[PDB]
């Protein structure tokens, strides 16, 4: 048992909305989880604690010192469905660096042995520039064991896919990671879903499942939480239901196979008009 | 102008006339100083206890600091190792500094290598930088192994020391087999000695994490021994030396005492010594291990006890006379073997030398400052010979170090006017020496800008510094001392007692003044 | 001896390195010719050290920090980031001067923002103005404040010149922010740039609508002579021996004030042309000041140096610098008359940063020493240009030199003394070669002018004659 | 004349699309733009130039050796309406500290005086986690004086308009830079309008225009191209012309007045339901 998974990403394409409601149904299938808040803005657990954690890491240490005179009790906090949140932390806008603010973070967490033993899954929330070492911590040795990169038929959105792809061989060559699919995250373009699927297969993994975009996401977000507690019966709570299972029952864990500028725009062309 | 037959260097010869005057006209000229009375005046401020009220408000400036960055450590450590050549992934000019520091302290050649990433390499990552730089080193240095650091700039780019030696392997740049253990070394979290704690698991972890299922514990019947940062030659050889005087088994982990210390017969030897790899792979089969300086040694603690299942015993630094006996003791009940009468003869040798020189020792105020476990060792020492450490600081020191210090300076009535300070650095130790005066401070050589100072306000204020601790970098050999066991006691012993008879001989040297105290026998 | 040797040498020696080291160390090194004008066909400077090879090279913030800022007296200078790079560089340059440290002077003090995490993650911009409030209290007398950058600093983009403006108005002082992260450039050299760079934009120009300074016809400034040992006063006095008004030096025993007084000079007198060939050349554009290079290392070049900076002025000057080479001929005369025989013949191999190289030729030679050997840490082309004239025939140049190389080099040419940096003198002297450190003087007096020649004769008999050399091997060991 | 102007907002919110399609408009009313790219992907750029620039700065100063070595002419490149474009570039993501990136790029451009003398606007497209100091060089001392924050009515986007408001009041105090005002791109969120229009209040600044989400921003995009390019009478191409104008004329410049947490859960809330 224990998964660790990193979720990877355009930038706003949806991965900490995604991840919660996924996660969310988990719980529901009785699975335990924690979840790793990756991102300076600490907003990777706020539909699962109702409310938008101030207890992170890297403020909690600068005030107690330092991270070593720092406890899991008082950063780790249980939430809806018994899931446990962590927020890395970091500066506000503009100052400071937060990339090493991950790295002190995670390395606390696994000092502090909150990877427990009985824990289901373990998901990483990165934000969607990966701009530099710090914020690919997640999957160094014996972290995350697979990865998900959310997107959408948007240009800029599967370039950014791509791209992380790109990064992700170093890792995953060095390691065990593993690109485990793509998680499409639907926002409405044209042919949307051949084009995820065309993408995939170029890169060598799996579309995992397309989640359509639908405002209950957006009512249920409103109200601090997630479809799954907002509205079960909603039919988009289902289709994070279906997403929870693919990921629980995903076998497919491949190296990332980039494709270069021209076979992506050509892909574009193909798959994009009509 | 000069005299053939008398040449002299810049402090003769600047004090020659024709030098004063021109300095004096540069300085009236050009300089715009501040008059001699505003200084005098600032000065005098600077010596007050309103002063270091304001001294000690300090939260952002850090004024003379008393500790390094952690890849000094990390260096240090790795020169431990048989044919092992430090590897600094990261700045060049970090390296640079870190040479010359060493070189300078122990006046001894220090090799180690940097794989100089630039501005490009910050940019775009060191991973390229890493593999041509192992190829490299190991294709024209030759060394068995590479033992991996980091510069600041690599550890604030989160570069992955792990993946990137991987690839360097995956690609072909060095050999898979070749050992290449690695440690992140923040130069902004702990100090030097965290570099080296942390080099140190690191190349523990290397040669032994994936290799426990053969391993059982005191099946070769030794005890391994981890210095820790260490920079007294003489440290080294008594701990082998004593052990060996007990027909004690030991394997000591980290031993650099071999490459600070070769021969001048005409060739340069890189490489000398050094613990070995076999020893380090069977280091899990030992009956248990020591951490001699436990204070900075905590995470290789916790990997010794979790992996190798050794119970490492609570012990303190092997210095003075009661901490030296525990050592002996339970290195005796962990390998069974009796303290022998030579050993016991020693102690009592000390205790001989601490009864001859009484008298001199007690109630003499020290300053002291250094690392956590040596400041502990003298603080401890000190006061069984009577003295009275009242300043004491630590600027690398913690918490807990604070907690356990007052408890070994409450047991005892010597320790009553004795303040523990951490997180402190020399300006605020030369306010406690001005507003607290005691009547020597011990410490590297960056006391002697205090002494300097202290004089300066009179003859009467001087506080002289004995020279202990690291770096020492104004007198010659220092580093060849020993501070652990009866012979380090010994030696601190000396060099205390003759340190305040030296002192005391130079205020009664006036002919008709005070020349009365000047005995021939002290 | 024969280039054909030497060249051979040089490959023999590149044997050992992968191919791509092999092919650009190959670009550094070189055999001397007396006639190439044009440096760039015989070897290639100023480029990146190749990993892993054991360089000597410091960094841009040793540059900026080390060289050029922290030589000034009443300046107190930051080493903003990781205590570290302060505390390696405290006191370990000999740039001497005279001052009360801690209250009028801070040359020998290490101050520092000792960043730790929470400076890195959070920024230190907060703490950067709070430390500049604390130092105006602990250090009243402080005439102005620089914030040299550490390699942290320069990655997480502080924002140090607001905090210098904003801080620097509000205390009306003097703060100068330098981008000196260490990891900038290749080596020391681009952090001289930055450093003059600094001062130009921060610090020259404050005194450019004053005329309360009353110059002469024969005011001068010295720059580029960071007085090691008391280099630059022992060279203060000659030119002040022969009718100059020495109004500034530049970082020696250096005052801001008289750095703020040197755009009022008729000229720059350079010792340094790699570090302050920048400001000579701003200055000049700028203020329409003329500079010239001059080297008083030794004897012939103190004497050709005297001369040619008098040609600059009138004939009472040019009076006077007969007067001075007349006074001190008796001194070094006497100098040569009883080093020269100990010393006459004897091999030298030099390896310096930027300009001693070069410039501590001469010298040799007036005790009958030959170089033949010589290169640089961090010099550029022009530098090089410079230095064939300079060297002897068939002598071997190299640039950035690794210690695979300089050791491989000094076996086989096995000279009698060898002159370089800290870092290498412990790996000769074990080899039972004389060595003496180029950088620091090896701890002892000034080497500049007629005065630092008689020290300088001494320290390379004391240890080229010394007794210990002969005592390397064993008696029972043949 | 010469009006520097830096675009920042939410991960993905649209800001390197709507500033291309906002210059395209620029050239069209016949004035003079350079676009400065300033995140380690370089595709701020791509529907100017109808291609994936591929002469970065950074790129191109470590094969020109160091960034003294390099020239503009190889890294300024000129597109549609004569638009001036510049990369910063950095590394693929997961390695290497994207931050630097731009500041050495910003700094070699400072430096060859490349912000030319008859330019009528310079734009800097930011990316949208600005996680440290150098993705705020473009609002340093001296640089844009206008900053433009692109939003929509989601919460999280929301969320990070008011977070990066923060970011600005240092720069803003310190120097002379202002928040021209809020750009919605719109999401067809519910009641979308009315919640920009109330976070803009709330923060002191406006809601310059409301570009309305239409697929054909993706058709043109699919082809490299902006709207106004691609076809000249779309109803888009107007929407654009229109932000053109609104920026052109802006007068509304001032520092940003961040409001806490829970006064934007209560501010979605109210304008958020039905
Ligand atoms: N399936 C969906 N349907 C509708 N809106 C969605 C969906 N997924 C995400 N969103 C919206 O997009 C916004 C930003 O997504 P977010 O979870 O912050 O992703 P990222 O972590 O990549 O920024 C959320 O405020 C939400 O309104
Ligand atoms: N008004 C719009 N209508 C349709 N698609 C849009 C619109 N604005 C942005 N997009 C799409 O969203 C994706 C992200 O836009 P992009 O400019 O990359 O934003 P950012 O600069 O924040 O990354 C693009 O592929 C584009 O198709
Ligand atoms: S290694 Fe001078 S260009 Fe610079 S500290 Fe020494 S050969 Fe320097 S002369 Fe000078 S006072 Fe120097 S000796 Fe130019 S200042 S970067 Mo190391
Ligand atoms: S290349 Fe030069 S010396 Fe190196 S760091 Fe950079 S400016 Fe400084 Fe500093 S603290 Fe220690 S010594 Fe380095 S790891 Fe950082
Ligand atoms: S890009 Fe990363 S390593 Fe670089 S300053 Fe920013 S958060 Fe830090
Ligand atoms: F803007 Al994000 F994950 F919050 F890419
Ligand atoms: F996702 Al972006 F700029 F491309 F914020
Ligand atoms: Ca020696
Ligand atoms: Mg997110
Ligand atoms: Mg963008």
Same mark, same amino acid.
């Given at each position: 048992?224990?998964?660790?998974?990193?979720?990877?990403?355009?930038?706003?394409?949806?991965?900490?909305?995604?991840?919660?409601?996924?996660?969310?149904?988990?719980?529901?299938?009785?699975?335990?989880?924690?979840?790793?808040?990756?991102?300076?803005?600490?907003?990777?657990?706020?539909?699962?604690?109702?409310?938008?954690?101030?207890?992170?890491?890297?403020?909690?240490?600068?005030?107690?010192?330092?991270?070593?005179?720092?406890?899991?009790?008082?950063?780790?906090?249980?939430?809806?469905?018994?899931?446990?949140?962590?927020?890395?932390?970091?500066?506000?806008?503009?100052?400071?660096?937060?990339?090493?603010?991950?790295?002190?973070?995670?390395?606390?967490?696994?000092?502090?042995?909150?990877?427990?033993?009985?824990?289901?899954?373990?998901?990483?929330?990165?934000?969607?520039?990966?701009?530099?070492?710090?914020?690919?911590?997640?999957?160094?040795?014996?972290?995350?064991?697979?990865?998900?990169?959310?997107?959408?038929?948007?240009?800029?959105?599967?370039?950014?896919?791509?791209?992380?792809?790109?990064?992700?061989?170093?890792?995953?060559?060095?390691?065990?990671?593993?690109?485990?699919?793509?998680?499409?995250?639907?926002?409405?373009?044209?042919?949307?879903?051949?084009?995820?699927?065309?993408?995939?297969?170029?890169?060598?993994?799996?579309?995992?499942?397309?989640?359509?975009?639908?405002?209950?996401?957006?009512?249920?977000?409103?109200?601090?939480?997630?479809?799954?507690?907002?509205?079960?019966?909603?039919?988009?709570?289902?289709?994070?239901?279906?997403?929870?299972?693919?990921?629980?029952?995903?076998?497919?864990?491949? #190296?990332?196979?980039?494709?270069?500028?021209?076979?992506?725009?050509?892909?574009?062309?193909?798959?994009?008009?009509? | 102008?000069?005299?053939?037959?008398?040449?002299?260097?810049?402090?003769?010869?600047?004090?020659?006339?024709?030098?004063?005057?021109?300095?004096?006209?540069?300085?009236?000229?050009?300089?715009?100083?501040?008059?001699?009375?505003?200084?005098?005046?600032?000065?005098?401020?600077?010596?007050?206890?309103?002063?270091?009220?304001?001294?000690?408000?300090?939260?952002?400036?850090?004024?003379?600091?008393?500790?390094?960055?952690?890849?000094?450590?990390?260096?240090?450590?790795?020169?431990? !190792?048989?044919?092992?050549?430090?590897?600094?992934?990261?700045?060049?000019?970090?390296?640079?500094?870190?040479?010359?520091?060493?070189?300078?302290?122990?006046?001894?050649?220090?090799?180690?290598?940097?794989?100089?990433?630039?501005?490009?390499?910050?940019?775009?990552?060191?991973?390229?930088?890493?593999?041509?730089?192992?190829?490299?080193?190991?294709?024209?240095?030759?060394?068995?192994?590479?033992?991996?650091?980091?510069?600041?700039?690599?550890?604030?780019?989160?570069?992955?020391?792990?993946?990137?030696?991987?690839?360097?392997?995956?690609?072909? !740049?060095?050999?898979?087999? !070749?050992?290449?253990?690695?440690?992140?070394?923040?130069?902004?979290?702990?100090?030097?000695?965290?570099?080296?704690?942390?080099?140190?698991?690191?190349?523990?972890?290397?040669?032994?994490?994936?290799?426990?299922?053969?391993?059982?514990?005191?099946?070769?019947?030794?005890?391994?021994?981890?210095?820790?940062?260490?920079?007294?030659?003489?440290? !080294?050889?008594?701990?082998?030396?004593?052990?060996?005087?007990?027909?004690?088994?030991?394997?000591?982990?980290?031993?650099?005492?071999?490459?600070?210390?070769?021969?001048?017969?005409?060739?340069?030897?890189?490489?000398?010594?050094?613990?070995?790899?076999?020893?380090?792979?069977?280091?899990?089969?030992?009956?248990?291990?020591?951490?001699?300086?436990?204070?900075?040694?905590?995470?290789?603690?916790?990997?010794?006890?979790?992996?190798?299942?050794?119970?490492?015993?609570?012990?303190?630094?092997?210095?003075?006379?009661?901490?030296?006996?525990?050592?002996?003791?339970?290195?005796?009940?962990?390998?069974?073997?009796?303290?022998?009468?030579?050993?016991?003869?020693?102690?009592?040798?000390?205790?001989?030398?601490?009864?001859?020189?009484?008298?001199?020792?007690?109630?003499?105020?020290?300053?002291?400052?250094?690392?956590?476990?040596?400041?502990?060792?003298?603080?401890?020492?000190?006061?069984?010979?009577?003295?009275?450490?009242?300043?004491?600081?630590?600027?690398?020191?913690?918490?807990?170090?604070?907690?356990?210090?007052?408890?070994?300076?409450?047991? @005892?009535?010597?320790?009553?006017?004795?303040?523990?300070?951490?997180?402190?650095?020399?300006?605020?130790?030369?306010?406690?020496?001005?507003?607290?005066?005691?009547?020597?401070? #011990?410490?590297?050589?960056?006391?002697?800008?205090?002494?300097?100072?202290?004089?300066?306000?009179?003859?009467?204020?001087?506080?002289?510094?004995?020279?202990?601790?690291?770096?020492?970098?104004?007198?010659?050999?220092?580093?060849?001392?020993?501070?652990?066991?009866?012979?380090?006691?010994?030696?601190?012993?000396?060099?205390?007692?003759?340190?305040?008879?030296?002192?005391?001989?130079?205020?009664?040297?006036?002919?008709?003044?005070?020349?009365?105290?000047?005995?021939?026998?002290? | 001896?024969?280039?054909?040797?030497?060249?051979?040498?040089?490959?023999?020696?590149?044997?050992?390195?992968?191919?791509?080291?092999?092919?650009?160390?190959?670009?550094?090194?070189?055999?001397?010719?007396?006639?190439?004008?044009?440096?760039?066909?015989?070897?290639?400077?100023?480029?990146?050290?190749?990993?892993?090879?054991?360089?000597?090279?410091?960094?841009?913030?040793?540059?900026?920090?080390?060289?050029?800022?922290?030589?000034?007296?009443?300046?107190?200078?930051?080493?903003?980031?990781?205590?570290?790079?302060?505390?390696?560089?405290?006191?370990?340059?000999?740039?001497?001067?005279?001052?009360?440290?801690?209250?009028?002077?801070?040359?020998?003090?290490?101050?520092?923002?000792?960043?730790?995490?929470?400076?890195?993650?959070?920024?230190?911009?907060?703490?950067?103005?709070?430390?500049?409030?604390?130092?105006?209290?602990?250090?009243?007398?402080?005439?102005?404040?620089?914030?040299? @950058?550490?390699?942290?600093?320069?990655?997480?983009?502080?924002?140090?010149?607001?905090?210098?403006?904003?801080? /620097?108005?509000?205390?009306?002082?003097?703060?100068?922010?330098?981008?000196?992260?260490?990891?900038?450039?290749?080596?020391?050299?681009?952090?001289?740039?930055?450093?003059?760079?600094?001062?130009?934009?921060?610090?020259?120009?404050?005194?450019?609508?004053?005329?309360?300074?009353?110059?002469?016809?024969?005011?001068?400034?010295?720059?580029?002579?960071?007085?090691?040992?008391?280099?630059?006063?022992?060279?203060?006095?000659?030119?002040?021996?022969?009718?100059?008004?020495?109004?500034?030096?530049?970082?020696?025993?250096?005052?801001?004030?008289? #750095?703020?007084?040197?755009?009022?000079?008729?000229?720059?007198?350079?010792?340094?042309?790699?570090?302050?060939?920048?400001?000579?050349?701003?200055?000049?554009?700028?203020? /329409?000041?003329?500079?010239?290079?001059?080297?008083?290392?030794?004897?012939?070049?103190?004497?050709?140096?005297?001369?040619?900076?008098?040609?600059?002025?009138?004939?009472?000057?040019?009076?006077?610098?007969?007067?001075?080479?007349?006074?001190?001929?008796?001194?070094?005369?006497?100098?040569?008359?009883?080093?020269?025989?100990?010393?006459?013949?004897?091999?030298?191999?030099?390896?310096?940063?930027?300009?001693?190289?070069?410039?501590?030729?001469?010298?040799?030679?007036?005790?009958?020493?030959?170089?033949?050997?010589?290169?640089?840490?961090?010099?550029?082309?022009?530098?090089?240009?410079?230095?064939?004239?300079?060297?002897?025939? @068939?002598?071997?140049?190299?640039?950035?030199?690794?210690?695979?190389?300089?050791?491989?080099?000094?076996?086989?040419?096995?000279?009698?003394?060898?002159?370089?940096?800290?870092?290498?003198?412990?790996?000769?002297?074990?080899?039972?070669?004389?060595?003496?450190?180029?950088?620091?003087?090896?701890?002892?007096?000034?080497?500049?002018?007629?005065?630092?020649?008689?020290?300088?004769?001494?320290?390379?008999?004391?240890?080229?004659?010394?007794?210990?050399?002969?005592?390397?091997?064993?008696?029972?060991?043949?």
């Amino acid at each position: 048992a224990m998964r660790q998974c990193a979720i990877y990403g355009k930038g706003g394409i949806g991965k900490s909305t995604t991840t919660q409601n996924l996660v969310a149904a988990l719980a529901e299938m009785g699975k335990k989880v924690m979840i790793v808040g990756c991102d300076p803005k600490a907003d990777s657990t706020r539909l699962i604690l109702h409310s938008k954690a101030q207890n992170t890491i890297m403020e909690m240490a600068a005030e107690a010192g330092t991270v070593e005179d720092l406890e899991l009790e008082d950063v780790l906090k249980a939430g809806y469905g018994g899931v446990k949140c962590v927020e890395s932390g970091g500066p506000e806008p503009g100052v400071g660096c937060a990339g090493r603010g991950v790295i002190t973070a995670i390395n606390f967490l696994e000092e502090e042995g909150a990877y427990e033993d009985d824990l289901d899954f373990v998901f990483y929330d990165v934000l969607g520039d990966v701009v530099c070492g710090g914020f690919a911590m997640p999957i160094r040795e014996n972290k995350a064991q697979e990865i998900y990169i959310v997107c959408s038929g948007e240009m800029m959105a599967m370039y950014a896919a791509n791209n992380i792809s790109k990064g992700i061989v170093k890792y995953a060559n060095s390691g065990s990671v593993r690109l485990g699919g793509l998680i499409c995250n639907s926002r409405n373009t044209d042919r949307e879903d051949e084009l995820i699927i065309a993408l995939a297969n170029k890169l060598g993994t799996q579309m995992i499942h397309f989640v359509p975009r639908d405002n209950v996401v957006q009512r249920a977000e409103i109200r601090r939480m997630t479809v799954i507690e907002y509205d079960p019966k909603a039919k988009q709570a289902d289709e994070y239901r279906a997403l929870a299972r693919k990921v629980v029952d995903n076998k497919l864990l491949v #190296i990332p196979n980039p494709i270069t500028m021209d076979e992506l725009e050509e892909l574009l062309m193909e798959f994009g008009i009509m | 102008s000069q005299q053939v037959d008398k040449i002299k260097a810049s402090y003769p010869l600047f004090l020659d006339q024709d030098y004063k005057d021109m300095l004096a006209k540069k300085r009236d000229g050009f300089e715009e100083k501040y008059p001699q009375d505003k200084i005098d005046e600032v000065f005098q401020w600077t010596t007050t206890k309103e002063y270091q009220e304001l001294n000690f408000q300090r939260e952002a400036l850090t004024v003379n600091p008393a500790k390094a960055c952690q890849p000094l450590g990390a260096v240090l450590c790795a020169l431990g !190792f048989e044919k092992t050549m430090p590897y600094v992934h990261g700045s060049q000019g970090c390296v640079a500094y870190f040479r010359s520091y060493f070189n300078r302290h122990f006046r001894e050649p220090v090799s180690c290598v940097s794989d100089s990433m630039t501005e490009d390499a910050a940019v775009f990552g060191g991973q390229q930088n890493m593999k041509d730089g192992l190829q490299n080193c190991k294709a024209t240095y030759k060394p068995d192994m590479i033992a991996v650091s980091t510069t600041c700039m690599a550890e604030v780019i989160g570069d992955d020391l792990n993946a990137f030696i991987n690839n360097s392997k995956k690609e072909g !740049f060095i050999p898979d087999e !070749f050992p290449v253990p690695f440690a992140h070394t923040p130069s902004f979290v702990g100090s030097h000695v965290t570099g080296w704690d942390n080099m140190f698991e690191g190349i523990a972890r290397y040669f032994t994490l994936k290799s426990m299922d053969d391993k059982v514990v005191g099946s070769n019947k030794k005890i391994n021994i981890v210095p820790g940062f260490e920079t007294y030659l003489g440290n !080294f050889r008594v701990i082998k030396r004593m052990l060996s005087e007990m027909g004690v088994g030991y394997s000591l982990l980290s031993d650099p005492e071999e490459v600070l210390d070769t021969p001048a017969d005409g060739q340069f030897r890189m490489y000398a010594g050094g613990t070995t790899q076999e020893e380090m792979k069977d280091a899990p089969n030992a009956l248990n291990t020591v951490l001699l300086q436990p204070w900075h040694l905590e995470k290789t603690k916790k990997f010794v006890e979790g992996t190798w299942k050794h119970e490492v015993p609570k012990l303190n630094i092997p210095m003075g006379l009661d901490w030296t006996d525990e050592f002996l003791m339970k290195v005796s009940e962990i390998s069974g073997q009796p303290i022998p009468a030579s050993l016991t003869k020693e102690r009592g040798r000390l205790v001989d030398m601490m009864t001859d020189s009484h008298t001199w020792l007690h109630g003499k105020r020290f300053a002291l400052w250094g690392d956590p476990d040596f400041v502990m060792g003298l603080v401890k020492f000190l006061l069984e010979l009577g003295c009275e450490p009242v300043h004491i600081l630590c600027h690398n020191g913690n918490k807990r170090w604070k907690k356990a210090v007052d408890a070994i300076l409450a047991a @005892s009535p010597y320790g009553k006017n004795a303040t523990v300070y951490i997180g402190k650095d020399l300006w605020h130790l030369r306010s406690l020496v001005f507003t607290d005066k005691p009547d020597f401070m #011990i410490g590297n050589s960056y006391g002697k800008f205090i002494q300097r100072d202290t004089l300066h306000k009179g003859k009467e204020f001087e506080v002289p510094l004995i020279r202990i601790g690291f770096p020492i970098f104004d007198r010659h050999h220092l580093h060849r001392s020993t501070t652990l066991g009866y012979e380090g006691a010994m030696q601190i012993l000396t060099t205390l007692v003759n340190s305040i008879l030296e002192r005391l001989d130079e205020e009664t040297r006036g002919m008709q003044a005070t020349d009365y105290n000047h005995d021939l026998v002290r | 001896m024969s280039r054909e040797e030497v060249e051979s040498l040089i490959q023999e020696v590149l044997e050992v390195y992968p191919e791509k080291a092999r092919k650009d160390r190959n670009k550094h090194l070189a055999v001397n010719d007396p006639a190439v004008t044009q440096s760039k066909k015989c070897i290639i400077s100023n480029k990146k050290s190749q990993p892993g090879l054991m360089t000597i090279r410091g960094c841009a913030y040793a540059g900026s920090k080390g060289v050029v800022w922290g030589p000034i007296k009443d300046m107190i200078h930051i080493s903003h980031g990781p205590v570290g790079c302060g505390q390696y560089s405290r006191a370990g340059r000999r740039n001497y001067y005279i001052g009360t440290t801690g209250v009028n002077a801070f040359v020998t003090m290490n101050f520092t923002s000792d960043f730790q995490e929470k400076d890195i993650v959070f920024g230190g911009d907060k703490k950067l103005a709070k430390l500049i409030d604390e130092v105006e209290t602990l250090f009243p007398l402080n005439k102005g404040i620089s914030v040299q @950058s550490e390699c942290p600093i320069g990655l997480i983009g502080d924002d140090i010149e607001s905090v210098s403006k904003v801080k /620097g108005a509000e205390l009306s002082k003097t703060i100068v922010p330098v981008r000196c992260e260490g990891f900038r450039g290749v080596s020391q050299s681009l952090g001289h740039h930055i450093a003059n760079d600094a001062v130009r934009d921060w610090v020259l120009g404050k005194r450019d609508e004053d005329t309360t300074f009353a110059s002469t016809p024969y005011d001068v400034a010295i720059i580029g002579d960071y007085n090691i040992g008391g280099d630059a006063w022992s060279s203060r006095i000659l030119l002040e021996e022969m009718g100059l008004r020495c109004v500034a030096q530049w970082s020696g025993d250096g005052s801001i004030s008289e #750095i703020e007084l040197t755009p009022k000079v008729k000229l720059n007198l350079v010792h340094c042309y790699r570090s302050m060939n920048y400001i000579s050349r701003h200055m000049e554009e700028k203020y /329409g000041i003329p500079w010239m290079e001059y080297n008083f290392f030794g004897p012939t070049k103190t004497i050709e140096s005297l001369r040619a900076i008098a040609a600059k002025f009138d004939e009472s000057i040019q009076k006077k610098c007969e007067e001075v080479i007349a006074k001190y001929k008796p001194e070094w005369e006497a100098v040569v008359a009883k080093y020269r025989p100990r010393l006459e013949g004897k091999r030298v191999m030099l390896y310096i940063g930027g300009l001693r190289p070069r410039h501590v030729i001469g010298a040799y030679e007036d005790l009958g020493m030959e170089v033949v050997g010589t290169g640089y840490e961090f010099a550029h082309n022009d530098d090089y240009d410079r230095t064939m004239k300079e060297m002897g025939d @068939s002598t071997l140049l190299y640039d950035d030199v690794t210690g695979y190389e300089f050791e491989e080099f000094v076996k086989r040419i096995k000279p009698d003394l060898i002159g370089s940096g800290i870092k290498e003198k412990f790996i000769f002297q074990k080899m039972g070669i004389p060595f003496r450190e180029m950088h620091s003087w090896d701890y002892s007096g000034p080497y500049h002018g007629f005065d630092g020649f008689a020290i300088f004769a001494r320290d390379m008999d004391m240890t080229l004659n010394n007794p210990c050399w002969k005592k390397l091997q064993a008696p029972w060991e043949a």
